[PDB]
Amino acid sequence: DFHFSAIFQPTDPHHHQTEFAKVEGSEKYVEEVEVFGRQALKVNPEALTILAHRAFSDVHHFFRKDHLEGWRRAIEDPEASDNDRYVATTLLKNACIAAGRVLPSCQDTGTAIVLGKRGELCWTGGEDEKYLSKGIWNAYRYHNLAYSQTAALDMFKECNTGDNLPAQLDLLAVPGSDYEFLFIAKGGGSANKAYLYQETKALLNPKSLRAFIEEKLKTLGTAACPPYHIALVIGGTSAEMTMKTVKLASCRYYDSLPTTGDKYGRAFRDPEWEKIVMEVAQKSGIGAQFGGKYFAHQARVIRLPRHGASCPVGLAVSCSADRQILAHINKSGIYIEQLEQNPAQYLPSVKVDLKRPIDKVRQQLSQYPVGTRVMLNGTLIVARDIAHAKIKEMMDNGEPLPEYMKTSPIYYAGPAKTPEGYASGSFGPTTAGRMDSYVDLFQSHGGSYITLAKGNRSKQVTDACKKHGGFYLGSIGGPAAILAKDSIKQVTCLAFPELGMEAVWKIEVEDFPAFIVVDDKGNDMYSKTLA
- Judged by the rule CB under 6 A, the positions of this chain that interact with ligand SF4 are 106, 108, 187-190, 224-225, 319-321, 428, 477-478
Task: Point out which span in 88-96, 187-195, 420-428, 504-512 binds its own copies (CB under 8 A).
Answer: 187-195
Q: For residue 238, state whether it binds its own copies (rule: CB under 8 A).
A: yes
Q: How far is the CB of 396 from its own copies (least distance, A)?
A: 10
531 binds, among its own copies, ligand SF4, none (CB under 5 to 8 A by kind): none
Q: 321 contacts which partner out of its own copies, ligand SF4, none, CB within 5 to 8 A by kind?
A: ligand SF4
Nearer to its own copies, 111 or 256 (CB): 111
> In whole angstroms, how close is the CB of 107 to ligand SF4 at the nearest point?
7
User: Do 340 and 65 form a contact (C-beta atoms < 8 A)?
Assistant: yes
Give SS3 for 286.
strand
- Determine which residue in the list 308, 348, 398, 421 makes contact with its own copies, applying CB under 8 A: 308
Q: Which stretch binds its own copies (CB under 8 A): 147-155, 367-375, 445-453, 483-491?
A: 147-155
Cα 417 versus chain centre, distance: 18
Report the alpha-carbon angle 470-486-473, nearest 5.
15
Q: How many other CB atoms are there within 10 angstroms of residue 357's CB atom?
A: 9
Find the shortest distance in angstroms from Cβ 38 to its own copies. Answer: 8
Please report, for residues 233, 251, 449, 457, the alpha-carbon distance to residue 468 in angstroms, rounded to integers and kept in the order given. Answer: 43, 43, 8, 16
Give the Cα separation of 224 and 228 in Å (integer). Answer: 8
Q: Which stretch binds its own copies (CB under 8 A): 72-80, 83-91, 128-136, 476-484?
A: 128-136
The CA distances from residue 511 to 83, 373, 507, in Å, are 18, 11, 13
Select from 109-117, 341-349, 354-362, 510-518 the region that touches its own copies (CB under 8 A).
109-117
In the bound state with ligand SF4, the residue whose beta carbon lies nearer, of 307 and 459, is 307
Q: Is 237 in the site for its own copies (CB under 8 A)?
A: yes
The region of 61-69, 120-128, 320-328, 487-495 touching its own copies under the rule CB under 8 A is 120-128
Contact present, 146 and 430 (Cβ < 8 Å): no
Q: What pairs with residue 35 in β-bridges?
A: 38
What is the chain's alpha carbon radius of gyration, rounded to the nearest angstrom? 24
CB of 170 to its own copies, least distance (A): 8
402 touches, from its own copies, ligand SF4, none (C-beta below 5 to 8 Å by class): none
- Separation of alpha carbons 343 and 194, rounded Å: 28
CA 167, CA 186: separation in Å to the nearest integer? Answer: 11
142 binding its own copies? (CB under 8 A): no
**Minimum Å distance from CB 480 to ligand SF4?**
7
Main-chain dihedrals φ then ψ at residue 230, nearest 5 degrees: -100, 125
397 lies in the site for its own copies, by CB under 8 A: no
Strand blocks (E) in 393-445: 410-411
Based on the shown chain and the rule CB under 8 A, indicate whether residue 378 belongs to the binding site for its own copies. no
Of the pair 167, 329, the CB lying nearest its own copies is at: 167
Respond yes or no on whether the N-terminal peptide bond of residue 166 is cis (omega within 30° of 0): yes
Query: Which residue, 106 or 281, is less far from ligand SF4 as judged by CB?
Result: 106
Which one of ligand SF4, its own copies, none is in contact with 37 (Cβ closer than 5 to 8 A by kind)?
none
Q: Which neighbouring-strand residues pair with 336?
A: 21, 327
> Coil, strand, or helix at residue 28?
helix
> By C-alpha distance, which of 522, 528, 429, 427 is closest to 473?
429
Q: Does 78 bind its own copies (CB under 8 A)?
A: no
Contacting residue, 171, 375, 395, 441, with its own copies by CB under 8 A: 171
Rounded-to-integer distance, Cα 354 and Cα 374, Å: 12
- Contact flag: residue 32 with its own copies (CB under 8 A): no
Shortest distance, position 116 Cβ to its own copies, whole Å: 7
Does residue 306 touch its own copies according to CB under 8 A?
yes
- Do the Cβ atoms of 163 and 140 come closer than 8 Å? yes
154 lies in the site for its own copies, by CB under 8 A? yes
Contact between 243 and its own copies by CB under 8 A: the answer reads: yes
Look up residue 264 and give its DSSP letter. T
224 binds, among its own copies, ligand SF4, none (CB under 5 to 8 A by kind): ligand SF4
Minimal distance in Å, beta carbon 147 to its own copies?
9
Shortest spacing between CB 328 and ligand SF4, in angstroms: 26
Closest CA to 442 of 494, 392, 389: 392
Contact assessment for residue 49 and residue 132, using Cβ atoms and an 8 Å cutoff: yes
For residue 472, the SS3 value is strand
Q: Based on the shown chain and the rule CB under 8 A, indicate whether residue 464 belongs to the binding site for its own copies.
A: no
Give which of its own copies, ligand SF4, none residue 76 binds (C-beta under 5 to 8 Å, depending on kind). none
268 contributes a contact to its own copies by CB under 8 A = yes
Supply the DSSP string of 76-132, one letter for each residue. H-TTS-HHHHHHHHHHHHHHHHHTTSSS-SSS---EEEEEEEEETTEE--S-HHHHH
Question: Which residue from 236, 431, 208 is spatially nearest to 317, judged by alpha carbons?
Answer: 431
Residue 477 contact among ligand SF4, its own copies, none, beta carbon within 5 to 8 Å by kind: ligand SF4
77 vs 385, beta carbon nearer its own copies: 385
229 binds its own copies (CB under 8 A): no
Identify the sign of the CA torsion 447, 449, 453, 455: positive
- For residue 205, the partner it binds in its own copies, ligand SF4, none, with Cβ less than 5 to 8 A by kind, is its own copies
Of the candidates 11, 17, 39, 200, which one interacts with its own copies according to CB under 8 A? 200
Strands 122-123, 38-43: pairing is parallel
